Design an enzyme around this catalytic site. Structure first.
Site, mmCIF file in Angstrom:
data_model
loop_
_atom_site.group_PDB
_atom_site.id
_atom_site.type_symbol
_atom_site.label_atom_id
_atom_site.label_comp_id
_atom_site.label_asym_id
_atom_site.label_seq_id
_atom_site.Cartn_x
_atom_site.Cartn_y
_atom_site.Cartn_z
ATOM 1 N N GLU A 152 1.114 -0.710 -4.883
ATOM 2 C CA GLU A 152 0.200 0.334 -5.314
ATOM 3 C C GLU A 152 0.891 1.691 -5.397
ATOM 4 O O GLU A 152 0.964 2.419 -4.404
ATOM 5 C CB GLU A 152 -0.991 0.434 -4.360
ATOM 6 C CG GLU A 152 -2.040 1.451 -4.810
ATOM 7 C CD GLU A 152 -2.502 2.372 -3.692
ATOM 8 O OE1 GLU A 152 -3.212 3.358 -3.987
ATOM 9 O OE2 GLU A 152 -2.157 2.114 -2.520
ATOM 10 N N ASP A 178 0.771 -1.249 0.000
ATOM 11 C CA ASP A 178 0.000 0.000 0.000
ATOM 12 C C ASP A 178 0.807 1.308 0.000
ATOM 13 O O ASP A 178 1.906 1.380 0.549
ATOM 14 C CB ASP A 178 -0.959 -0.023 1.206
ATOM 15 C CG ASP A 178 -1.798 1.243 1.336
ATOM 16 O OD1 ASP A 178 -2.509 1.607 0.380
ATOM 17 O OD2 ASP A 178 -1.758 1.874 2.409
#
Ligand code: NA
Ligand code: NA
Ligand code: NA
Length: 480
Positions: free
Chosen positions: A261, A231
């Site tokens: 990400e 993340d």
């Protein structure tokens, strides 16, 4: 067995906080395997700011819904035992488990601490807009309810380097802790995008670097992961993520898929990051996300030939993880860029029937987003999972030649019965196109798996067939 891989994000932003999601996963396992799903990406499974937290408001990475902390024992998804029971089911049904990993920050500190800080310019964190002064930031973490199980490491302000809220005078500002530097290297938007939200972790400290490495391994063994979904990695010093990944793989016997990400509608930015990464992980194709988005907003005027142009998958289809939307892009959220119902079938066909990229099905689409009256697209997506699972094999042939009608084909592989398919679609007035599909499938009669066109295409002696599509629709013909 040469079976194509398809990943699923098993959660949406507005899921119910009934703590029953882990159990849903345990039962939907087989069904999911059966539909063509081979790997599930679970949401953050550790204690967040509060129980209703989706997971990114991470508080205690060792509390997987096992300790009464932050007003709850279970996470929004359920208890630790229910998560382990779920992961077991997935394994038995041949589905890999990729855990969501949040290391950029922490939220829900147990108590504040006096800290020297300076206000920075939001649009350029390099520039201070105020002098140093003492603020009361929420940086103390004791995980009281955990009782030091698994780890006795406690977090304090000197582990962070910035926050966006001063409790002393109660104001919002992007505060850089005085005498600390913004992480580096990191995304250069706003000058330095190291700071995003909550208490921002400073990785320059060796005890931090080892704690998250140690945790990562603990985590990976505890849940028996098969990979991670890293993340906000564009706000995390690049070197450390590369470091963490290598460390993690070094500790585990099992392989470890790793999709990060890096949220930027810029393939260059992503390519750059993959350079520093030494392509030891794939990245969510964010430019593709916005390509679909632009197409959805714009309508038919959008020139379908440039639909894959700019995408990461186009450039490096080996380090790409394609998707149509997620919890951030769904209506009302932070990175909203929702693909409308009309174009969503076209987008899914693009990432599920083509040979490049590792496609990802979004829970919100599959089962729907009730909160926003978004219907479950399960029917439309299953037919495509069927396409990818049993037909999208063998040599591919593209035809992004017209601005409305465009398509592609897969000759199929001798190693997989009746495989082979032909995707045709139009974002404007429908049409047809003569496409090659392999002279070895001559005489075959192909039909539309989606049912948007009753055409029955027969493959001629040269391996050619003419396929049709209605306006703003998509069909996927196969030897069924
Ligand atoms: Na950061
Ligand atoms: Na999108
Ligand atoms: Na068009």
């Amino acid at each position: 067995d040469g079976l194509n891989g398809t990943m699923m994000q098993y959660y949406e932003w507005h899921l119910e906080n009934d703590g029953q999601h882990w159990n849903r996963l345990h039962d939907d396992a087989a069904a999911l395997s059966d539909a063509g799903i081979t790997a599930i990406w679970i949401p953050p499974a550790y204690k967040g700011n509060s129980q209703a937290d989706v997971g990114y408001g991470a508080y205690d990475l060792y509390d997987l819904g096992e300790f009464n902390q932050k007003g709850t024992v279970r996470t929004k998804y359920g208890t630790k035992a229910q998560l382990e029971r779920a992961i077991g089911s997935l394994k038995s049904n041949d589905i890999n488990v990729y855990g969501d990993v949040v290391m950029n920050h922490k939220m829900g500190a147990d108590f504040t601490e006096a800290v020297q800080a300076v206000q920075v310019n939001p649009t350029n964190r390099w520039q201070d807009i105020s002098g140093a002064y003492t603020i009361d930031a929420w940086t103390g973490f004791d995980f009281s309810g955990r009782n030091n199980a698994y780890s006795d490491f406690k977090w304090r302000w000197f582990h962070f380097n910035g926050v966006d809220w001063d409790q002393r005078y109660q104001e919002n500002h992007i505060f850089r802790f005085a005498n600390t530097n913004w992480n580096w290297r990191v995304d250069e938007e706003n000058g330095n995008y190291d700071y995003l939200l909550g208490s921002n972790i400073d990785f320059s400290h060796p005890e931090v670097q080892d704690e998250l490495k140690d945790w990562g391994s603990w985590f990976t063994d505890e849940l028996d992961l098969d990979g991670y979904r890293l993340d906000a990695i564009k706000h995390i010093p690049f070197w450390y993520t590369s470091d963490w990944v290598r460390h993690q793989r070094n500790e585990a016997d099992q392989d470890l898929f790793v999709v990060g990400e890096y949220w930027k509608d810029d393939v260059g930015a992503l390519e750059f990051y993959l350079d520093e990464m030494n392509w030891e992980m794939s990245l969510f194709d964010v430019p593709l996300n916005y390509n679909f988005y632009r197409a959805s907003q714009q309508g038919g005027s959008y020139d379908m030939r440039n639909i894959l142009r700019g995408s990461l998958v186009e450039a490096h289809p080996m380090h790409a993880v394609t998707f149509v939307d997620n919890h951030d892009t769904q209506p009302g959220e932070s990175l909203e860029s929702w693909v409308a119902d009309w174009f969503k079938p076209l987008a899914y066909a693009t990432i599920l029937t083509r040979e490049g990229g590792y496609p990802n099905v979004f829970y919100g689409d599959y089962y729907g987003i009730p909160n926003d009256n978004i219907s479950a697209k399960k029917d439309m997506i299953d037919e495509l999972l069927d396409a990818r699972q049993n037909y999208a094999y063998g040599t591919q042939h593209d035809y992004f030649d017209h601005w409305d009608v465009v398509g592609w084909t897969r000759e199929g592989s001798s190693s997989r019965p009746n495989s082979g398919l032909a995707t045709i679609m139009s974002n404007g007035p429908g049409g047809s196109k003569w496409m090659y599909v392999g002279r070895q499938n001559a005489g075959q009669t192909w039909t539309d798996l989606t049912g948007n066109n009753g055409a029955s295409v027969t493959i001629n002696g040269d391996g050619w067939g003419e396929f049709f599509t209605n306006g703003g629709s998509v069909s996927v013909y196969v030897n069924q």
